[PDB]
Every structure is written in C-alpha cells, then in structure tokens.
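Reading group handout, session on sequence-to-structure problems. Before we discuss, look at one worked example. The prompt was deliberately terse, the way you'd type it at a terminal:

> structure pimd protein

The input record follows.
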Amino acid sequence: SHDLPCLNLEPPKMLKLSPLLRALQDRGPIHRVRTPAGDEAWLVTRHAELKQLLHDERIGRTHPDPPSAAQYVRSPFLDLLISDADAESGRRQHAETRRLLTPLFSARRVLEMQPKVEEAADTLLDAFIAQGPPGDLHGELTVPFALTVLCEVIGVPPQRRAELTTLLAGIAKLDDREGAVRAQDDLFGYVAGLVEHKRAEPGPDIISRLNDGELTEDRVAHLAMGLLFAGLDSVASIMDNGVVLLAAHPDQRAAALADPDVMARAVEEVLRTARAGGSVLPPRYASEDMEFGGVTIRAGDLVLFDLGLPNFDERAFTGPEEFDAARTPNPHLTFGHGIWHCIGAPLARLELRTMFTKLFTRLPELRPELPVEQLRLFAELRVVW
Ligand code: HEM
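And the output record:
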C-alpha cells in the first residue's frame, strides 16, 4: 500500500546531510519511514521537536512483544536493550539508574578524574608517537585511551585489564542471539569479581562509591558494565571524527590551539558535526498512543532518534554545514537531552579537550592518510604526521 521513504545505511558525507534526509527535514518535523531493516518507524527531523520528544515519558525501552517490535537495524546486541517490562516499570528502573549514576559525575568528582585522564593520554600518546607514522589512530590510540580512562574511573586494577579488553572484543565480534547473551554473561561475571574485590579494598572510583551506597553486587555490576558500554565506542568515534574534522580545517585548528576557550568550543563543534545523519540511538517505542506534530504515534511504534538531524537543522544553527571551531552558542544534541541525557558528558568533554589539545600540540601536521572521499568508504583510521 504505502510508499514510505526508505532510510539506508550509506555513510554520510562530511558536514552535509544526505539528499533524502535534507528532503525530509525540509518537508516537515515528523514522518512515517521505512528503516534499513524494513520496518515502519517515526523519524523526527528537526531540533525543536526532537528535543521535546527526548523529554516525553511516553517513549521508552519497553515493548509488550519485543520479538515483533519494529527495528532500525537487526542487531542481537541492541535486542538485549528492549525491556519486556510494563511501561511504568521501565520508567521507574530508568529514573533509578539516573539517580544512582548522576552523583558519580558531579563537578568535584569529574575534577578528581581529570589527572587520570591527563596521565592516560600522555602515556598512550608517548607510545603511539614512538611507533612512528603512519599509525592507526583508532586501534592504537583513541580506543585504548577511552578504555584506559574507563578503567581508571570505574576501578579496574591494571592486572585485570587484559581480560577486560578480551571480553570486550568478545562482545564486539558476536553476531547471533545465543553468542550475544553468552558474551554478556561472561563480562558480567568478570565485572562481579571486580565488584567483590573493591568491597574488600575500596578506591576513589565508581565501583567503590556504588558499593558505599549499599547497592547489591548484581546492581553495581550492571551499572559498571552499562558504563563500559556507554563510554567506550562513543568517545573513540567522536575523537576519530574530530581528528578528521580538525585536520581538514587548519585555520580553526590553529585558533583552537591558541586559546583553550576556543578549544572548548571546538570540542562542542566536533560533537555537533561528527556525524551528519544516519546514526540512530537504540530503539525506543511509544508506550501509549500520542498525538505529536500532526500525527498519532501508536502504542508500540518505533520512534527514531537521529541526533545528526537536529545537529544540522538550519532552524537551530546558522550555517549548519560550516565547521566553526568558535561557534557560539552551540545547542547540539550529541549528548541527547531530557530523559535520555548523557550522564558521562562532563567526562567525555574532558577526554576530547585533552586528547585534541595534546595530539595537535605535539603533532601539528597530523592528518588522515586517505583523503576524506576514500575514508567515507572507523575500523581503522591511519594517520601520518
Ligand atoms: C564520547 C562521547 C559520548 C557521547 C557522544 C555520548 C552520548 C550519549 C547519548 C546520546 C546518550 C543517550 C543514549 C540513548 O538513550 O540511546 C548517552 C547516555 C549515557 N551516557 Fe553517554 N555519551 C558519551 C560518552 C559517555 C561516557 C564517557 C560515559 C561515562 C563513562 C557515558 C555515560 C552515559 C550514561 C550512564 C548514559 C545513560 C543515561 C540515561 O539513559 O538516562 N557516556 N550518552
């Protein structure tokens, strides 16, 4: 019957939404679309409306029949995110997780993380530079940096790190529902052991602090594993894309390097411009019928949160296709918003400001080996300097 527009997985161009996504954003704030998996979904295309939906408690992770729930992509890994719970349960669990995690990232606490973040970048950059160019910025710097910072902050003693790495590759390579339940189970038991160690021997770290709050071992282990998933690929991929963006815009890179305040804004601009559409948060579903934006979203419908659409909405940014390291203000939604806002954001900002500063201070000429066109077609990111 339908002729819904069909979204696809083609990599976006640098600083430009795809023709189809510009046409949708142009046409209206909200549309019925077909996802790359072939299911129906609502795509919200504009900054104001997405922001408002991100605060709407009628959208969440529960679905009464998860196996027939619409999906953006088939992914055994993301399937485990879809709660079977009643909607109210889902909301309470979510609010309680936010209550438990938010104190861990207070101003004072993130200040206390900063010297480990500085130290980890110096150590890893020292090693990456010693190996000489060309090097794989992804596999040899940005991923290890993000993971090291996570170890330091969550409380993974150095001796246990080799196994963590391995269990994490072991969830990265997974590809069926059995293998993905099993890989989760192994990581979980590993993490429960970390929790028991820290009960015996507290540190100034997330696991000890959650222990202190009289949470049971399962609950601490679940929170710690969630933090591992939230803080790893996200950081590495914004960092990778930032190096590409900053290498490609020499005068702004120079302005960012001359003034830490410009560097702070440059980080915000990398966050805004790292992906120009096509990356969608994990699935989220209306838990009850809702009128929104001219349509009726039905209980159980898939609603897509593509944060790159708002980030390139000319209604929210002047000249959205321009990389402006000094853009101010910069209300990007790369950390989500409302009920879905990144609790690690202050830490993520710190990792990005620290690594862009040290990379481009020590290696002023650093750039990708391939030109952007070829790069677009990261598993690896080879750079020279
Ligand atoms: C590197 C840049 C990062 C970006 C761009 C990012 C982005 C986001 C986004 C968009 C959300 C909402 C996700 C969703 O509902 O699907 C989120 C949630 C979350 N992030 Fe981050 N994140 C980053 C790094 C981190 C770090 C380093 C940590 C902590 C170690 C962290 C911890 C969290 C937590 C705990 C949530 C759950 C909050 C909730 O669902 O209410 N993130 N992040």
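Points for discussion. First: The chain has one domain: 1-385. Second: The pocket of protoporphyrin IX containing FE is lined by residues 98, 101, 227, 230-231, 234-235, 238, 281-282, 334-336, 340, 342-344, 347-348 (CB under 6 Å).
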